[PDB]
Design an enzyme around this catalytic site. Structure first.
Site, PDB file in Angstrom:
ATOM      1  CG  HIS A  19      -1.841   1.153   1.414  1.00 51.81           C
ATOM      2  ND1 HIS A  19      -3.372   0.860   1.541  1.00 51.81           N
ATOM      3  CD2 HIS A  19      -1.692   2.221   1.276  1.00 51.81           C
ATOM      4  CE1 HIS A  19      -3.956   1.997   1.435  1.00 51.81           C
ATOM      5  NE2 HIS A  19      -3.065   3.061   1.148  1.00 51.81           N
ATOM      6  CG  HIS A  21      -0.799   7.033  -0.959  1.00 47.49           C
ATOM      7  ND1 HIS A  21      -1.717   6.941  -1.911  1.00 47.49           N
ATOM      8  CD2 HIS A  21      -1.017   6.419  -0.009  1.00 47.49           C
ATOM      9  CE1 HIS A  21      -2.939   6.616  -1.419  1.00 47.49           C
ATOM     10  NE2 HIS A  21      -2.391   5.937  -0.153  1.00 47.49           N
ATOM     11  CE  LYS A 101      -7.368   1.885  -1.213  1.00 44.95           C
ATOM     12  NZ  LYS A 101      -6.328   2.637  -1.011  1.00 44.95           N
ATOM     13  CG  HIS A 135      -9.852   4.435   2.749  1.00 42.63           C
ATOM     14  ND1 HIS A 135      -8.544   5.077   2.857  1.00 42.63           N
ATOM     15  CD2 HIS A 135     -10.797   4.838   3.663  1.00 42.63           C
ATOM     16  CE1 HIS A 135      -8.668   5.774   4.028  1.00 42.63           C
ATOM     17  NE2 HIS A 135      -9.962   5.672   4.569  1.00 42.63           N
ATOM     18  CG  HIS A 169      -5.151   1.618   5.599  1.00 44.42           C
ATOM     19  ND1 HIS A 169      -6.596   1.960   5.892  1.00 44.42           N
ATOM     20  CD2 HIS A 169      -5.102   2.770   4.559  1.00 44.42           C
ATOM     21  CE1 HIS A 169      -7.040   2.633   4.875  1.00 44.42           C
ATOM     22  NE2 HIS A 169      -6.362   3.020   4.220  1.00 44.42           N
ATOM     23  CG  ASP A 241      -2.030   4.882   3.723  1.00 38.84           C
ATOM     24  OD1 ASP A 241      -2.146   5.259   2.728  1.00 38.84           O
ATOM     25  OD2 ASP A 241      -2.800   5.342   4.703  1.00 38.84           O
TER      26      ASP A 241
HETATM   27 ZN   LIG Z   1      -6.647   4.399   2.690  1.00 37.26          ZN
HETATM   28 ZN   LIG Z   2      -3.625   4.950   1.129  1.00 38.48          ZN
END
Ligand SMILES: [Zn+2]
Ligand SMILES: [Zn+2]
Ligand SMILES: [Zn+2]
Ligand SMILES: [Zn+2]
Lengths: 334, 338
Positions: A19, A21, A101, A135, A169, A241
């Protein structure tokens, strides 16, 4: 093994970040190497502006990442932002994406979530063995958003018992327990949720650098997360994350990329084993999706103190990292 | 009441702010006027560095407050920081102080010298003298447990103090939970103060979207049902509840505290029209306190509030400090005749 060498305190093989970004453009150039140098692969989230909803934009982004990393071996595992895609489309993309996602938007609990919009796509995804990354937060009171989504995870698991549903997460005992109730439920855990609780964020002085979504919860939650990660439970995988934001105190997200391995190293030595860290960071993922690698990436950690800089900086951006200014016990040669 | 004139000519009589932080030195000179102008009196908390623990220093601070207010009609109600004072000391201070404020050890701003034990014998001599001398105990009710539970977990403490000291007035300051709203009804010697912000915000405003440090205070804003219970007590004018702003400025993130002094009356005025009556506002801001303590005034301070829009300054400046006010940059529907 009692006696060991300073230059080899821990050895990790094919570490994966499930995960991540990486943002885009100038920011991407600054931060991609920080993940690329410590991981052989990472699931790249699609929440760009605008989000990745087609295969042409995806490939172009993939290309930008491959340029910015400049540390092959590094395979970005690409994903699309969830929307109502049809069977023909998914069949077309299965060889190009790792997963889809889902970012839920506008959910109240008394909930107001209709899975009917999702059904055709989820049915296709199931048949094409494409995983659904979620999420998992509603729009209820901030402390309850994840726990109230549990019933949404249950519903999806029952309605699609052959779909792989990764609860991203997780931050609650509720989901730590739900994880074990359905075979097709999986989860990723961040570095920070194994260390902080709400008290760290607003218990004393407000600390924006520890602010993220989902919010850090209670001690019992933190312990439930640690028990799964430290025991190397087969269905949990590490997903940082890592989500940077340009330094201005209010935006959500923690940039943990450059300190992940050292902090996990210390954490598992104190509370677990090298073997369980190996599972949490790689083996679990590899077992669930049958991944294999041509050229193994071996990272060796040396027991040599270093201070995390106050920022990771570029001409165009300045990012404050997790543990900024702290002194870590382990280090990788970069 | 369906018909009214020029603007909403709402009169408020002798407003009291039963929980206020005025700091000291240069900061005091800047903020004190912002309160002294809208209130006839205010309980002045003693959390100074070092904390007010003797009459000499209290008199000294009072003098400083009086100068800082200047020409305003305003009586500061002084307090001492809690510690194990003896009867002899309390007897000499009863007419100089309004109350004694108990801060649990290291829970809020300037509390390191706070109480670290609620052992009954350890506190008995002092609380009994306070009881005999009709001095009230004002308390910042929070334990050191998980942040969202600090106040509710403090309930058992207020309860034992109430049972063991039944003639002592115990004021649960800035309550923020349904737990304390309910506990208030269980003991005759329990009272409470409520802030402006806690009638309005919940944890979601502080961290639900973006982190909003200007809405960060102790005790932390909590749940929707917590806010509703606070509003029900305030709006109904419940007799044992008194308005206490807990206005606490900080020089410009972030430290705990909302500096609401400059905007209290108009914000309260709007709130009570939408949800209550002018009578209940008069009770919450003044009559409840007056009845509880038997206060009297040489001459009333009547304030009138009209519905004339105005924007809240983004800061209240001067030579030494600059403070960001609550509702900063906001447009309030009511105003006071400056
Ligand atoms: Zn998230
Ligand atoms: Zn994320
Ligand atoms: Zn307080
Ligand atoms: Zn206070």
């Amino acid at each position: 093994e009692n006696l060991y060498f300073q230059s080899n305190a821990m050895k990790l093989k094919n570490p994966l970040d499930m995960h991540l970004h990486l943002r885009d453009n100038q920011m991407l150039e600054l931060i991609a190497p920080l993940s690329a140098r410590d991981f052989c692969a990472a699931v790249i989230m699609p929440n760009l502006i605008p989000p990745l909803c087609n295969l042409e934009d995806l490939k172009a982004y993939k290309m930008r990442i491959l340029k910015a990393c400049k540390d092959e071996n590094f395979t970005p595992l690409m994903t699309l932002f969830f929307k109502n895609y049809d069977e023909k489309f998914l069949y077309s993309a299965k060889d190009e994406i790792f997963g889809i996602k889902l970012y839920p938007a506008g959910i109240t609990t008394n909930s107001s979530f209709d899975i009917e919009y999702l059904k055709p796509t989820l049915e296709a995804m199931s048949d094409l063995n494409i995983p659904l990354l979620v999420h998992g937060e509603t729009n209820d009171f901030v402390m309850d958003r994840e726990s109230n989504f549990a019933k949404i995870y249950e519903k999806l698991a029952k309605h699609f018992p052959r779909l792989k549903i990764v609860m991203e997460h997780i931050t609650t005992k509720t989901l730590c327990e739900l994880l074990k109730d359905y075979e097709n439920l999986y989860a990723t855990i961040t570095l920070h949720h194994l260390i902080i609780t709400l008290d760290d964020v607003i218990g004393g002085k407000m600390n924006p650098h520890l602010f993220c979504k989902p919010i850090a919860k209670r001690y019992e939650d933190k312990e439930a997360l640690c028990e799964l990660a430290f025991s190397g439970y087969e269905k949990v995988m590490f997903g940082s994350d890592s989500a940077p934001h340009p330094k201005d105190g209010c935006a959500a997200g923690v940039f943990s990329a450059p300190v992940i391995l050292p902090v996990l190293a210390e954490l598992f030595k104190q509370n677990s084993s090298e073997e369980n860290l190996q599972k949490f960071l790689s083996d679990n993922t590899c077992k669930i999706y049958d991944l294999k690698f041509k050229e193994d990436k071996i990272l060796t950690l040396e027991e040599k103190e270093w201070q995390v800089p106050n920022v990771y900086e570029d001409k165009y951006n300045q990012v404050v990292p997790y543990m900024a200014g702290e002194i870590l016990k382990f280090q990788l040669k970069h």
